Amino acid sequence: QSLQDKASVLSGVDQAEAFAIDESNLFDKLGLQTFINLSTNFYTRVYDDEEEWFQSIFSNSNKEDAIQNQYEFFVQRMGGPPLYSQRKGHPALIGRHRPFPVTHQAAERWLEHMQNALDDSVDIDQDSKIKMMKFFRHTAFFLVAGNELK
Amino acid sequence: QSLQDKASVLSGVDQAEAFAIDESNLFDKLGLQTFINLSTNFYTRVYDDEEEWFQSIFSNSNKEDAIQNQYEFFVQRMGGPPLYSQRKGHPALIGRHRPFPVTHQAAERWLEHMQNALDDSVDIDQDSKIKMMKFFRHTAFFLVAGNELK
Numbered sequence: 365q366s367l368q369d370k371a372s373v374l375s376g377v378d379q380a381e382a383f384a385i386d387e388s389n390l391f392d393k394l395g396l397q398t399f400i401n402l403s404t405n406f407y408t409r410v411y412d413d414e415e416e417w418f419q420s421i422f423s424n425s426n427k428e429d430a431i432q433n434q435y436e437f438f439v440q441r442m443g444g445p446p447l448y449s450q451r452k453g454h455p456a457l458i459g460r461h462r463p464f465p466v467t468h469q470a471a472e473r474w475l476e477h478m479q480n481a482l483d484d485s486v487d488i489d490q491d492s493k494i495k496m497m498k499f500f501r502h503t504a505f506f507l508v509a510g511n512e513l514k
Numbered sequence: 515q516s517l518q519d520k521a522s523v524l525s526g527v528d529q530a531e532a533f534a535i536d537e538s539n540l541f542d543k544l545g546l547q548t549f550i551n552l553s554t555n556f557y558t559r560v561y562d563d564e565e566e567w568f569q570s571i572f573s574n575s576n577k578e579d580a581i582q583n584q585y586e587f588f589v590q591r592m593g594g595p596p597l598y599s600q601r602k603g604h605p606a607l608i609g610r611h612r613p614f615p616v617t618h619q620a621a622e623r624w625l626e627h628m629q630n631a632l633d634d635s636v637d638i639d640q641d642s643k644i645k646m647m648k649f650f651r652h653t654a655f656f657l658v659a660g661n662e663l664k
């Protein structure tokens with residue numbers, strides 16, 4: 365059974381829905397600043413999280429560096445310039461999450477913070493929010509599936 | 515030490531040179547058919563390889579499916595439509611190579627076949643060949659670095 369199928373079964377979202385982001389250019393629609401704002405909001409919530417089991421996953425990471433890694437990845441993957449690879453090479457999401465305990469429960473907590481970040485946004489329309497959360501949700505469970513094999 | 519830095523040290527190519535592919539659109543320059551031809555040539559060489567230690571790495575894989583996975587990934591990453599993700603989701607190269615013994619020596623053998631495939635091409639110019647092999651070489655050693663941690 366493939367990683368992507370495991371993600372689809374766990375998450376309620378398959379790759380086809382998760383990658384509906386690719387049907388139009390979201391970077392062109394939303395703009396770079398919108399991504400920076402989303403990631404900054406998300407990571408503010410992460411680093412303020414009172415649940416130590418989740419907070420402490422990010423303890424070896426600087427918040428500002430994490431914000432940059434995230435929005436540069438989102439920008440690159442959602443139709444914008446490839447800033448992430450210029451700096452860091454392949455996204456390699458399963459490989460890069462290897463050090464962290466990416467459990468089913470951690471996925472839901474990540475996605476809670478991100479939903480709250482999307483709810484706080486001004487410059488993201490409803491169609492875009494739906495497509496982005498399908499992408500995020502499928503991806504989070506893809507990482508869960510990758511975590512299970514390491 | 516990061517995966518990308520380990521790749522750079524091993525390979526003689528850093529991420530900056532490896533991702534010079536992103537400076538212009540190679541898909542626009544070369545066209546889809548050129549990619550299909552390259553991957554078909556490459557994989558013909560792989561599956562005809564008399565060295566069992568290398569050949570047998572690909573024994574659980576169908577040749578035609580492998581050709582499709584490769585060129586769809588190259589097309590997606592080198593400026594073309596995102597065919598790979600439509601079908602399979604994230605490239606996740608480290609995760610997807612987890613089942614295979616991706617050693618330093620296997621990297622060099624892979625890159626031997628690919629060089630021979632590039633040498634056989636008609637529709638790839640010298641500037642493009644240089645950029646593609648920098649990308650491939652850095653990537654192969656990135657996978658070596660990922661292999662070392664699994």
Ligand code: HEM
Nearest residue numbers: 421422425430433434437460464470471474500503504507
């Ligand atoms: C499933 C629960 C998740 C957990 C617990 C988690 C945890 C982490 C942690 C601790 C980092 C290191 C922070 C940094 O230094 O940048 C990280 C990095 C990253 N995460 Fe996640 N993550 C999760 C899901 C996701 C999802 C759903 C995506 C994309 C949609 C994603 C994309 C990334 C990216 C692009 C990086 C930067 C990698 C790097 O450059 O080092 N993660 N994650």
Ligand code: HEM
Nearest residue numbers: 571572575580583584587610614620621624650653654657
């Ligand atoms: C380092 C030595 C390498 C070895 C021994 C190796 C081996 C393999 C094998 C056995 C597969 C499965 C064939 C399939 O079912 O598609 C595979 C898949 C793949 N490889 Fe490699 N590989 C290497 C390097 C690379 C490099 C340098 C790249 C990209 C530049 C790459 C990209 C891929 C892609 C995109 C797939 C398809 C993954 C999938 O969809 O399952 N590989 N590789």
Ligand SMILES: [Cl-]
Nearest residue numbers: 456459606609
């Ligand atoms: Cl990966």
Ligand SMILES: [O-]
Nearest residue numbers: 430434461474
């Ligand atoms: O993350």
Ligand SMILES: [O-]
Nearest residue numbers: 580584611624
């Ligand atoms: O490969």
